Design an enzyme around this catalytic site. Structure first.
Site, PDB file in Angstrom:
ATOM      1  N   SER A  50      -0.307   6.516  12.017  1.00 53.52           N
ATOM      2  CA  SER A  50      -0.904   6.668  10.680  1.00 53.52           C
ATOM      3  C   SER A  50      -1.537   5.377  10.169  1.00 53.52           C
ATOM      4  O   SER A  50      -2.647   5.407   9.657  1.00 53.52           O
ATOM      5  CB  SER A  50       0.095   7.271   9.678  1.00 53.52           C
ATOM      6  OG  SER A  50       1.327   6.602   9.655  1.00 53.52           O
ATOM      7  N   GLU A  51      -0.834   4.257  10.367  1.00 53.40           N
ATOM      8  CA  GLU A  51      -1.380   2.956  10.122  1.00 53.40           C
ATOM      9  C   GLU A  51      -0.843   1.935  11.101  1.00 53.40           C
ATOM     10  O   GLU A  51       0.249   2.066  11.647  1.00 53.40           O
ATOM     11  CB  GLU A  51      -1.090   2.469   8.705  1.00 53.40           C
ATOM     12  CG  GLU A  51      -1.496   3.412   7.567  1.00 53.40           C
ATOM     13  CD  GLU A  51      -0.373   4.384   7.224  1.00 53.40           C
ATOM     14  OE1 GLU A  51       0.792   3.956   7.093  1.00 53.40           O
ATOM     15  OE2 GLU A  51      -0.672   5.570   7.075  1.00 53.40           O
ATOM     16  N   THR A  52      -1.640   0.901  11.265  1.00 51.16           N
ATOM     17  CA  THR A  52      -1.355  -0.219  12.122  1.00 51.16           C
ATOM     18  C   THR A  52      -1.738  -1.377  11.256  1.00 51.16           C
ATOM     19  O   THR A  52      -2.805  -1.334  10.604  1.00 51.16           O
ATOM     20  CB  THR A  52      -2.217  -0.161  13.414  1.00 51.16           C
ATOM     21  OG1 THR A  52      -1.802   0.987  14.225  1.00 51.16           O
ATOM     22  CG2 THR A  52      -2.089  -1.440  14.214  1.00 51.16           C
ATOM     23  N   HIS A  81       3.922   2.876   2.927  1.00 47.46           N
ATOM     24  CA  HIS A  81       4.875   2.738   4.025  1.00 47.46           C
ATOM     25  C   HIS A  81       4.533   1.537   4.946  1.00 47.46           C
ATOM     26  O   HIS A  81       5.428   0.864   5.413  1.00 47.46           O
ATOM     27  CB  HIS A  81       5.180   4.089   4.732  1.00 47.46           C
ATOM     28  CG  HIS A  81       4.621   4.237   6.109  1.00 47.46           C
ATOM     29  ND1 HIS A  81       3.335   4.662   6.355  1.00 47.46           N
ATOM     30  CD2 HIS A  81       5.210   4.110   7.323  1.00 47.46           C
ATOM     31  CE1 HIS A  81       3.146   4.738   7.659  1.00 47.46           C
ATOM     32  NE2 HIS A  81       4.266   4.407   8.265  1.00 47.46           N
ATOM     33  N   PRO A  82       3.240   1.219   5.138  1.00 44.15           N
ATOM     34  CA  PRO A  82       2.847   0.056   5.942  1.00 44.15           C
ATOM     35  C   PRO A  82       3.255  -1.275   5.296  1.00 44.15           C
ATOM     36  O   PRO A  82       3.653  -2.207   5.990  1.00 44.15           O
ATOM     37  CB  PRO A  82       1.343   0.195   6.009  1.00 44.15           C
ATOM     38  CG  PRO A  82       1.136   1.680   5.761  1.00 44.15           C
ATOM     39  CD  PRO A  82       2.067   1.986   4.722  1.00 44.15           C
TER      40      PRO A  82
END
Lengths: 294, 294
Positions: A50-52, A81-82
């Site tokens: 979803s994210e990096t 959340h990241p």
């Protein structure tokens, strides 16, 4: 091979594989100038999470680190959340076992974070509300297969989420929405999806809810742990229940997908009688190591 | 925390982030008996990669290792790119810089692998062909936006792939299919998608092709590096061109998604005048470290 430290951190859990992962790349000892946006984008696309995120030296001593946040498709100016997972990763990367607050630098500006016994917390930048037409409502009820106990509404929390409440936690847990109907209706209505929730009525902890997040229009039929969703749920609950004191909402999510996320959404009554929305969770590093970079 | 070695290996590339990743968990020093299928499944679901694999002690000395192969949704009895990446990871995990052949144990039985200067190769277990109706063909042409230079056909290679050829590599590269039409037609037709290919006509290496793999019905609108697709392409080419000698097809893929996969599909004329289909590629470990497990 240049390799830099790498952690894949599970957010909203203390137990591995139960939360929502973020890949976090440690670029704190390399010049951000010397790293192209396309390079960063490519890494995020390749992890397919979803994210990096990428940690860089901050622009000014008042911040502990700069975070760049990416989906497989684009850079975001911010996400919840990241932020939490990246904070946990930072602490570990810099061997810090004592910080109780940090300030993240990102596109959105300064983001103060607190850490309390593993509970990592920031103020959500956006949590607006907006009523929806009774026509929209009836259709969504059709798509979900349940009548709501209050009028759903549109919550702007980054994504465009409809929030809808049902009788209790079990009812929410056991819902089986028609995903194609939902994709149809949300596509038509310009919404990302629906956040469904119901109260755990006999829970020791008050204001405990089971939540589910459905976003089939973007091909996430169910998001197993949805931080932007818990802010929506929090902000919704404020409008509907009109709380006078600072209220914590204890949100559990993801069991239908065999996960178990825990999110703490705080509705904080400020000194000015205004309201702020905090999101908090645990995070646990699951993959620890290094990653090859250019 | 129990942690075991972990590698995320990029398959069909020597350059990081250009291939298709496989997460590979080293369970070679723990009892497979003591690890539940649900545990394995959960890890694969959490990494959210096309496949996630697990190395275990083999059942018999004639194999070098047992590989269990998982998608986010199920265990597979076999797949190509996970086999290649897992082989590379095994070599590294066991500090082996000299093997030229290995035998993998899996659900499909024994899978001999050769390693030649980094080129990792196995025989594809399945490569059947089957003609398609001219009606199907015309519709697919509609969905892709191009006329084919030969009749497409249905290739059974694990997935159900239509293979279709266009005038050259550039034409294939620059195709812009209608993904929703393709999802419609493939759903109707019980196919996973289309493998599109065209020859690189002025290439030093003969039988070089550009390929693309489109599987919108399973929400992989384009698979950036598609090993089961190159076997399809290989087997198709044999039927259409009826090769008499062992022929290597050099397949390049993924540039429209900013990757660059290289696959070598061999049509091998056996001593019995029969034909076998080999797939080969490089792989490069990109994330190296450990993973927390139960």
């Amino acid at each position: 091979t240049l390799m830099v430290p790498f952690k894949q951190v599970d957010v909203f859990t203390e137990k591995p594989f139960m939360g929502n992962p973020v890949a976090v790349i440690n670029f704190l000892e390399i010049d951000e100038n010397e790293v192209s946006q396309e390079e960063l984008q490519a890494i995020a696309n390749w992890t397919n999470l979803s994210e990096t995120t990428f940690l860089f030296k901050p622009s000014d001593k008042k911040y502990d680190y700069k975070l760049r946040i990416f989906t497989p498709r684009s850079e975001l100016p911010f996400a919840g959340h990241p932020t939490i997972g990246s904070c946990k990763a930072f602490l570990e990367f810099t061997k810090n076992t004592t910080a109780t607050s940090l300030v993240q630098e990102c596109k959105i500006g300064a983001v103060p974070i607190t850490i309390n016994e593993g509970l990592i917390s920031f103020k959500a930048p956006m949590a607006d509300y907006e009523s929806i037409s009774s026509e929209m409502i009836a259709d969504y009820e059709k798509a979900i297969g349940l009548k709501f106990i209050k009028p759903p509404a549109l919550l702007h929390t980054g994504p465009e989420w409809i929030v809808a409440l049902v009788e209790d936690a079990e009812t929410c847990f056991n819902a089986n929405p028609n995903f194609a109907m939902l994709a149809h209706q949300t596509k038509q209505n310009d919404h990302v999806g629906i956040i469904l929730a119901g109260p755990k009525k006999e829970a020791a902890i008050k204001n405990s809810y089971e939540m589910r997040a459905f976003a089939p229009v973007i091909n996430v039929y169910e998001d197993p742990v949805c931080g932007s969703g818990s802010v929506a749920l929090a902000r919704y609950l404020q409008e509907v229940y009109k709380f006078e004191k600072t209220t914590d909402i204890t949100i559990s999510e993801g069991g239908r997908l065999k996960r178990n996320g825990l999110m703490l959404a705080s509705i904080k009554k400020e000194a000015d009688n205004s309201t702020s929305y905090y999101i908090a969770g645990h995070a646990t590093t699951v993959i620890d190591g290094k990653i090859k970079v250019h």
